[PDB]
RNA sequence: GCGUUGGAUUGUUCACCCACUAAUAGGGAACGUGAGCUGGGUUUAGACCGUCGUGAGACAGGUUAGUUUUACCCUACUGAU
RNA sequence: GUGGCCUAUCGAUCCUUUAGUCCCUCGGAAUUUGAGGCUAGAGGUGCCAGAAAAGUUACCACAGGGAUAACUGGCUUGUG
RNA sequence: GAAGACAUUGUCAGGUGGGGAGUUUGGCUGGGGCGGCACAUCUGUUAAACGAUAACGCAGAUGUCCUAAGGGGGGCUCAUG
RNA sequence: GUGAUUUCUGCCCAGUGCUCUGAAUGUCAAAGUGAAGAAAUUCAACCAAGCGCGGGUAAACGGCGGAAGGUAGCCAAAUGCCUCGUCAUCUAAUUAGUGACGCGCAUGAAUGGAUUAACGAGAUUCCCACUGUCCCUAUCUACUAUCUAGCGAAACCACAGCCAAGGGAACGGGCUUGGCAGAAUCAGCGGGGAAAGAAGACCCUGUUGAGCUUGACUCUAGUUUGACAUUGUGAAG
RNA sequence: GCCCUGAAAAUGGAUGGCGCUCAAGCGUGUUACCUAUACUCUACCGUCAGGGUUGAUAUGAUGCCCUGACGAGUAGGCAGGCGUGGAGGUCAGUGACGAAGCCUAGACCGUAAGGUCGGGUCGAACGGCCUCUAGUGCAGAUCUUGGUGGUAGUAGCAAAUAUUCAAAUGAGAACUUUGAAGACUGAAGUGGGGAAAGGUUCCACGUCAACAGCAGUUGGACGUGGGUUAGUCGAUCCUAAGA
RNA sequence: AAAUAUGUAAGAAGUCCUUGUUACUUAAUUGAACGUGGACAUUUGAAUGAAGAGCUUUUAGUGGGCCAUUUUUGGUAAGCAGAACUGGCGAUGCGGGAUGAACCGAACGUAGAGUUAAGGUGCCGGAAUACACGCUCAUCAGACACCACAAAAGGUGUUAG
RNA sequence: GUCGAAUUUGGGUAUAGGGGCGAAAGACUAAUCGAACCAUCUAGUAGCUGGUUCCUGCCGAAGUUUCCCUCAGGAUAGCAG
RNA sequence: GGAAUACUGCCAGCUGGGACUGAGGACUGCGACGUAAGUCAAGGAUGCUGGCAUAAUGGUUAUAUGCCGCCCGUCUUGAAACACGGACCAAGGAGUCUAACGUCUAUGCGAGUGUUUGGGUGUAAAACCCAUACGCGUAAUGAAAGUGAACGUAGGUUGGGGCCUCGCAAGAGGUGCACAAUCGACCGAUCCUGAUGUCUUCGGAUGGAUUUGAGUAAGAGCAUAGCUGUUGGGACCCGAAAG
RNA sequence: CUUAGUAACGGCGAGUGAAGCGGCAAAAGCUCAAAUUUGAAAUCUGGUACCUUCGGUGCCCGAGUUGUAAUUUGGAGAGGGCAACUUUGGGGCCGUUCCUUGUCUAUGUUCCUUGGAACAGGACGUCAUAGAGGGUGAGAAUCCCGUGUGGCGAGGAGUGCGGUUCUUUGUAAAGUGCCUUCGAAGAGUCGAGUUGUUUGGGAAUGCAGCUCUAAGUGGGUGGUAAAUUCCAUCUAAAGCUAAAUAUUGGCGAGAGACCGAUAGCGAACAAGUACAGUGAUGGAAAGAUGAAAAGAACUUUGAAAAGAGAGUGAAAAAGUACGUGAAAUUGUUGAAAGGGAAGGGCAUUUGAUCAGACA
């Protein structure tokens, strides 16, 4: 059962696995179904763009916080700063998320600009029903794409103050490690 | 394909290559990793030393994202600059025209110093740096800026 | 070459006596011979006793009851065309 | 002179426990208990490369074995 | 009529429990069993003058003992007649 | 549990069980209570039943020697190894039978001992009558077998079917060397075909089972004991 | 030294047999002769190794050619090939003027797996080559299903006392019908009715391929029809163990 | 104190002359180790041979053996049990031993010719009823290794000493 | 053997698989009993027995070492392609 | 005293009879005989002649004769076995597919590589096109906190194919990739040394150590496919007593 | 898709094993309880009459204050005060979107040969947004049905919406600024101990039994038990909700490098049928005459079944035991051999039989 110089393998097939095998024979069929469903939904919703406008947010975690992506919806504060109510925003094609909060001025200002540009690029048909026939744009994300914010200029002058970056990192670790013991010794005295 | 397998060659040879004496039985020696300490010990002590036992200390609810820190050496530092712009910066090695390299935007966490860089000033922004890497960058006239 | 027996007890081979007789010599043939017989013994399952075992049970110890199948083929043999 | 003049006198993983280092971790941040790691020993497997283990079957079962006993035959002839 | 905050019932805890359940009940071996250990080791011999070398071969031994019976130095010489 | 009647059922409570209005300061769960600590926690005291200790119990399990040492009886008995025991009787001759004898391998008292008229498709020995069981075979009847007309299977089958010796997987129809050997056949016959009927029920092996037993290992229904809940009201020591 | 005594086993018997005596026996010496898939030389097949040759105007430089050596084989490994169902491409492939399949002690090619042709039978599809793919090759498994032998015109068709003569019918009578005779069951029957169970087996006409282990004109067979009549006999009602 | 087996050496990674390094070593430039430079070529350091030598990865089957000569243990012995070296069978036909897994000879592509091995040449049966010197007469002669058995003790049988 | 009774027997009814029933043989429970029958889990597992399908060419073994509840099996080294 | 003969050996002395073989396919080579031309037995057979032209040779098949040949498959040290399966014939009948992997090989690209989750598109399960991520690789080492790979032509020495210089050649010198051995240097772990400076306990510079790592030292990997091997799966096919 | 065979669990053995982030498909939000309408229960089932009938109106009982409507669900929100503008609701009809259906919409059967049959071969044409497929006496684009491209109808569903038309809903409703006072938010429940089970969850992941049982700047969580001090993050013990996902059943369709009557479902057939079992259950075998029955009139032999002729057909070498018709096994005829098997190998004789070249 164990022979030769081979890696240790862990193949989890000791249950009735053959009863739960899923082969995606309908991969091509489902692609046709999704394309048909998108086409019939676009014809149903008039010239509406088939998707709602989304804000730009910072991804969490230290690993992914260097990038911005699309969030669920604009906050109540962002909607209010744009000059309209949340209820009217939902009926006009804007996603609203009540549980997200604003703590960064850069993110808040950018989402305010997105709402203002969106309002100036759409036409809202009156409730009377005359309904002038306008061409349908199938995507709002492509019309309003998300770009990573600029960080630094291409070239700049060298400014060295004589300090050491390695020394700065080492001292930062040391201060955090011994903060508790230093306070106790100071308090006991 | 079946037509190239040795099963086709074994047609008409009785034992199908498994021998007359030993034969091909179901599971002589057990199934899987059975008998790793009793009758398969020699094959485990060699080719797999360290298999049995425990060493370190446990860590409940590990999150690999906390330990994300890809490393980049100095010998590949200039590859982060587009090729069309590398040549002009190399030939124009001077202050107040030093290129800025943001290694975090390239997906790197710590800068290590292994190779040798050209004697050209460069502004390197990184989260972490080794002691040797900073010295070589400063020796060429550049600086390291810590970011978060 | 030719003969080498009749009986009491025992499942007995063996053994031991009675008697007759010229004589009651020893052996082999898959320890000749069970589709030839017989089935008393051994050696399935029931049951009893003694000793042993806490017990289920054991005993090359004793005791009693316990299904013996098929030839029309080939050859051999005996006779017959 | 790194135990007994020499050739034998002995023991893994897991777990427990002790000594050392007073060092590393408890992952939102700290102090103190507690717990978990690092290095070196001890508690033992004598079936001694180390499963935790009482019988009976004459009511019996299965896979096999002439690799193996209870008849002849063959070799041997101590014994007769 | 009796009985009474006790019985009863519910949940944990200790005992009892082959009535019942599940499982186990080494190996080597001139068959197996009983015995023995040739199962981890040591000395001499079998062993055929390098080394290696079998049998339930032959004659024995080991699971200890010692603050000295360990280490160094000095002086001395034993059995027996 | 023993197993009609008659007669009689001895001694042993140390062991294993069963049982007790017996004793107390042994062992002892959870809850509760106390101390220590900042707490987790730790330690200590108290402490139910059972166990332990003490008594009873053999027509309970069982024992009866060189806790008590087999009493009354009975026996080479369905129980005695040695053993075909010894003596007597029965026969011409008896490993049989019967009557006695008993240091009885290993008889024995309701795990019942001994004795018993009647009864028994039970197990044994002898005698009379009787007979083909035998000396020692012979003969008769019916139906088969046999032959014909019609009807018409099965077992089994590597290929097949004459011997002697040899060697060989140590017992050949075939191989080697010899003997020999002539179509097609019928009724019989049980020497051989290590004939046929079944993957040996005996024996061993397998890290294959099952039935049954027991202070084997690990558990469990039930039952018992304590705590808490159900669970309130009044008084006293 | 040779010979002899010592020297006894079971079916008949083996210097291999016959047979052999100045041997065809024993000891020893000298020559001739016989024959293995061994040795020597030659041809051919294959394998391995070392080499030669791109220069057009003729086809395979995985081609052609030169030189030397070698060849046993279970378990097992590797290499080059043969055959089968289906798929892409190609041969503007074969075919009702006969495709496939089958039969053929007829012919040819290959060491072989196999391939090709003629003759007969037959009636509607099928093949070569380059590649792809697999539910791809049978003598065995007390293999599965189906079919068929030897045995073999053989074992056998022998319990329950027993049949016989004549006529009628019919292609056909030991077995059907009628008559006559001889027998048996012997009233706890081989008689006369029923309960369960069966389900049309009851009755008539027609009728014999199969069934009645011989026969058959007969039948509980086959075909076509007919037949079971209740206020009083039962069910229905009652309660039993119980459900 | 053998025989048979058994370790090492027989050159270039060698020998020689001079002198550089070090924290080791010496009373000490004493030594040790490692080097710079110079001198000595393949009768370059015995024999014979060498379908080339060196090296790596991967994986099948097998892990019941048995026999013969010699050495050898237990056992009265065994076609018994157990070891040592080598050769065989197993896995292998072919000629010989009548016959036989292991003995003798010899190992195999398809054929032709020649010559042999072991074993044979009265007949079966291919080949001298050849040659030569002796021995033996059996009322149970004898006849070819492994191998299919015979002893102690005897004979004025006959032969030689 | 027994034959007027612990007799024989029809129909109705009750007891169902670790259960029933047993004047007790491990007997009987639909030809099935020391634990019935039917379907499924289930193609249950097997170090054990049997079988395992075309040709030619080249090379070509092992029954030995160490460890294993190892002794009819594996791992490991060797031999082979 | 002089010969002969026997025995053994040698001759690049001569010559007769018999058998088997004829491979190759212009020339080329080495020799012989010749003043010459030429010839020849000199790197493999030609010349002459007869009969028959078909079943005559030959093939196939049946039979006869000589010698030889035991029944296949299977387990086994050993099978023709008195060991097991097999009366006969037809058809069916057993190493498969999948997930994850080792070695090797082919292909694309290469410090990178992978279009097919999904989107676009379409002659519609095909083909064609594409963003962002993610996987693996490009850094290791510690239990962990953590730290993190150049003294030097990315080192020295020995052996190295190829190339360069000189040389007729033989050789000598120079340069030396891959690879092999060895001594160093660098990174992490462990054990020591503890500078400038201090939240007076922080900080850890510098220099060491018969210690240790699946490391560095001018990258090799990623993807697809194939044979072979591994593990889990019914797992090459058929088979238990049980639960 | 990935994280990942990873953290972790495990006689730490055999084995087991998630989650956050990141890319993508699909996207959608919400409402009760807890407040006095209190200058007016403003709410609702049912009955009855009528009507524009998936309902409406009037009237009358009843339910209900032990709470039915309006108003407010934590993102908030409510009671007062001030100043401002912004926006409508409910039905007919005609079309569109979708589904279920019907109908219409090209081109040779022209010559020759073979054949029973032309749908074969050969010659000469036509159509093609139709050369998919099937049928018709053999391989048919053009003989028939269809196929391709379009036109013209018939009957419904859903109000998704493209136009027209009838009703003013309403001193109605909703949104937005500022000041002030407030801001009710779910109990045998959270949580805790213990027991059992379960999980990767480890001083205990979820679930359940028993015991104990909260708080309101509170409560839960922050993957190592505890005390103390902070921080972060949500708001339990009440409720509704499309799409992306699943589908060996049902109904309607389209396909395959799948099987081809011992295969493929057990079943291509009067198949879950015949048949077996008391019962639960078990469970087969079985497809092919020919284009067309044209299925053999009539004669003759026989009691009859049938036979022999005749006849039908392209073929009775297709006769309802029917396409093709292999092997085992069997009959007849012909040839050969045979003294207790047969069969085989090498070589040649004899008999039979046969190809090749006559250059
Ligand atoms: Cl191969
Ligand atoms: Cl016992
Ligand atoms: Cl006769
Ligand atoms: Cl061929
Ligand atoms: Cl039941
Ligand atoms: Cl012959
Ligand atoms: Cl570390
Ligand atoms: Cl726990
Ligand atoms: Cl169906
Ligand atoms: Cl049934
Ligand atoms: Mg082979
Ligand atoms: Mg096999
Ligand atoms: Mg094996
Ligand atoms: Mg297998
Ligand atoms: Mg062990
Ligand atoms: Mg006998
Ligand atoms: Mg008999
Ligand atoms: Mg007999
Ligand atoms: Mg017999
Ligand atoms: Mg008897
Ligand atoms: Mg008995
Ligand atoms: Mg001493
Ligand atoms: Mg935490
Ligand atoms: Mg051991
Ligand atoms: Mg143990
Ligand atoms: Mg044996
Ligand atoms: Mg004697
Ligand atoms: Mg309770
Ligand atoms: Mg039990
Ligand atoms: Mg044993
Ligand atoms: Mg030695
Ligand atoms: Mg009495
Ligand atoms: Mg007595
Ligand atoms: Mg007596
Ligand atoms: Mg008594
Ligand atoms: Mg014989
Ligand atoms: Mg013999
Ligand atoms: Mg025989
Ligand atoms: Mg013979
Ligand atoms: Mg003969
Ligand atoms: Mg007879
Ligand atoms: Mg016989
Ligand atoms: Mg057997
Ligand atoms: Mg059996
Ligand atoms: Mg074992
Ligand atoms: Mg068991
Ligand atoms: Mg002679
Ligand atoms: Mg030869
Ligand atoms: Mg050879
Ligand atoms: Mg070969
Ligand atoms: Mg044809
Ligand atoms: Mg034939
Ligand atoms: Mg046809
Ligand atoms: Mg197959
Ligand atoms: Mg077959
Ligand atoms: Mg075979
Ligand atoms: Mg068979
Ligand atoms: Mg008869
Ligand atoms: Mg007869
Ligand atoms: Mg009879
Ligand atoms: Mg009669
Ligand atoms: Mg009578
Ligand atoms: Mg009468
Ligand atoms: Mg009738
Ligand atoms: Mg009849
Ligand atoms: Mg008849
Ligand atoms: Mg009828
Ligand atoms: Mg084996
Ligand atoms: Mg032996
Ligand atoms: Mg073998
Ligand atoms: Mg011989
Ligand atoms: Mg001759
Ligand atoms: Mg009765
Ligand atoms: Mg019994
Ligand atoms: Mg299987
Ligand atoms: Mg099975
Ligand atoms: Mg070879
Ligand atoms: Mg075996
Ligand atoms: Mg001829
Ligand atoms: Mg012959
Ligand atoms: Mg002959
Ligand atoms: Mg012969
Ligand atoms: Mg054997
Ligand atoms: Mg054999
Ligand atoms: Mg067998
Ligand atoms: Mg058989
Ligand atoms: Mg077949
Ligand atoms: Mg097959
Ligand atoms: Mg495969
Ligand atoms: Mg079990
Ligand atoms: Mg699980
Ligand atoms: Mg559960
Ligand atoms: Mg844990
Ligand atoms: Mg924990
Ligand atoms: Mg819901
Ligand atoms: Mg079928
Ligand atoms: Mg037809
Ligand atoms: Mg025809
Ligand atoms: Mg036909
Ligand atoms: Mg035939």
From Swiss-Prot, chain A:
GO terms for cellular component: cytosol; cytosolic large ribosomal subunit. One of its GO terms (molecular function) is structural constituent of ribosome. Belongs to the eukaryotic ribosomal protein eL13 family. PANTHER family: 60S RIBOSOMAL PROTEIN L13, LARGE RIBOSOMAL SUBUNIT PROTEIN EL13. It comes from the Eukaryota. Component of the ribosome, a large ribonucleoprotein complex responsible for the synthesis of proteins in the cell. The small ribosomal subunit (SSU) binds messenger RNAs (mRNAs) and translates the encoded message by selecting cognate aminoacyl-transfer RNA (tRNA) molecules. The large subunit (LSU) contains the ribosomal catalytic site termed the peptidyl transferase center (PTC), which catalyzes the formation of peptide bonds, thereby polymerizing the amino acids delivered by tRNAs into a polypeptide chain. Keywords: Cytoplasm, Phosphoprotein, Ribonucleoprotein, Ribosomal protein. It is found in: Cytoplasm. Component of the large ribosomal subunit (LSU). Mature yeast ribosomes consist of a small (40S) and a large (60S) subunit. The 40S small subunit contains 1 molecule of ribosomal RNA (18S rRNA) and 33 different proteins (encoded by 57 genes). The large 60S subunit contains 3 rRNA molecules (25S, 5.8S and 5S rRNA) and 46 different proteins (encoded by 81 genes). The modification Phosphothreonine is found at residues 143, 151. InterPro entries: Ribosomal_eL13, Ribosomal_eL13_CS. Disulfide bonds: none annotated. The keyword Cytoplasm applies. Present with 133000 molecules/cell in log phase SD medium. GO terms for biological process: cytoplasmic translation. This is Large ribosomal subunit protein eL13A. The keyword Ribonucleoprotein applies.
UniProtKB/Swiss-Prot annotation, chain B:
One of its GO terms (molecular function) is RNA binding. SUPFAM superfamilies: Ribosomal proteins L15p and L18e. Residues 1-13, 20-29 have a biased composition (Basic residues). It is found in: Cytoplasm. GO terms for biological process: cytoplasmic translation. A motif (Nuclear localization signal) lies at residues 6-12, 23-29. Signal peptide: none annotated. Coiled coil: none annotated. Keywords: Cytoplasm, Isopeptide bond, Ribonucleoprotein, Ribosomal protein, Ubl conjugation. InterPro entries: Ribosomal_uL15, Ribosomal_uL15/eL18, Ribosomal_uL15/eL18_sf, Ribosomal_uL15_CS. It holds the Pfam family Ribosomal_L27A. Residues 1-38 are annotated as: Disordered. One of its GO terms (cellular component) is nucleus. There is a cross-link at residue 95 (Glycyl lysine isopeptide (Lys-Gly) (interchain with G-Cter in ubiquitin)). It comes from the Eukaryota. Component of the ribosome, a large ribonucleoprotein complex responsible for the synthesis of proteins in the cell. The small ribosomal subunit (SSU) binds messenger RNAs (mRNAs) and translates the encoded message by selecting cognate aminoacyl-transfer RNA (tRNA) molecules. The large subunit (LSU) contains the ribosomal catalytic site termed the peptidyl transferase center (PTC), which catalyzes the formation of peptide bonds, thereby polymerizing the amino acids delivered by tRNAs into a polypeptide chain. Component of the large ribosomal subunit (LSU). Mature yeast ribosomes consist of a small (40S) and a large (60S) subunit. The 40S small subunit contains 1 molecule of ribosomal RNA (18S rRNA) and 33 different proteins (encoded by 57 genes). The large 60S subunit contains 3 rRNA molecules (25S, 5.8S and 5S rRNA) and 46 different proteins (encoded by 81 genes). Belongs to the universal ribosomal protein uL15 family. This is Large ribosomal subunit protein uL15. It comes from Saccharomyces cerevisiae (strain ATCC 204508 / S288c).
């Amino acid at each position: 059962a164990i022979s030769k110089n081979l890696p240790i393998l862990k193949n989890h097939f000791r249950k009735h696995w053959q009863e739960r095998v899923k082969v995606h024979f309908d991969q091509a069929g489902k692609k046709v179904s999704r394309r048909n469903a998108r086409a019939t939904r676009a014809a149903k919703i008039a010239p509406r763009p088939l998707d709602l406008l989304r804000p730009v947010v910072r991804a969490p975690t230290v690993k992914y916080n260097r990038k911005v992506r699309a969030g669920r919806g604009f906050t109540l504060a962002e909607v209010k700063a744009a000059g309209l109510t949340a209820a009217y925003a939902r009926t006009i094609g804007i996603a609203v998320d009540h549980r997200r909060q604003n703590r960064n001025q850069e993110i808040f200002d950018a989402n305010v600009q997105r709402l203002k540009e969106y309002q100036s690029k759409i036409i809202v048909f009156p409730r009377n029903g005359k309904a002038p026939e306008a061409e349908q744009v199938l995507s709002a994300a492509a019309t309003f794409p998300i770009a990573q914010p600029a960080t630094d200029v291409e070239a700049r002058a060298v400014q060295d103050n004589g300090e050491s970056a390695f020394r700065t990192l080492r001292l930062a670790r040391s201060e955090k490690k011994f903060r508790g013991i230093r306070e106790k010794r100071a308090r006991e005295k | 394909p079946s037509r190239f397998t040795k099963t086709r060659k074994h047609r008409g040879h009785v034992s199908a290559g498994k021998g007359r004496i030993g034969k091909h039985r179901k599971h002589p020696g057990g199934r899987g990793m059975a008998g790793g300490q009793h009758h398969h010990r020699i094959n485990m002590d060699k080719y797999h030393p360290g298999y049995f036992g425990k060493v370190g200390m446990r860590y409940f609810h590990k999150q690999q994202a906390h330990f994300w820190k890809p490393v980049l050496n100095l010998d590949k530092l200039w590859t982060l600059i587009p090729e069309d712009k590398r040549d002009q910066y190399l030939k124009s090695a001077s202050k107040e025209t030093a290129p800025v390299i943001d290694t975090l935007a390239a997906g790197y966490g710590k800068i290590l110093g292994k190779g040798r860089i050209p004697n050209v000033p460069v502004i390197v922004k990184a989260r972490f740096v080794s002691k040797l890497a900073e010295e070589k960058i400063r020796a060429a006239g550049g600086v390291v800026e810590l970011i978060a």
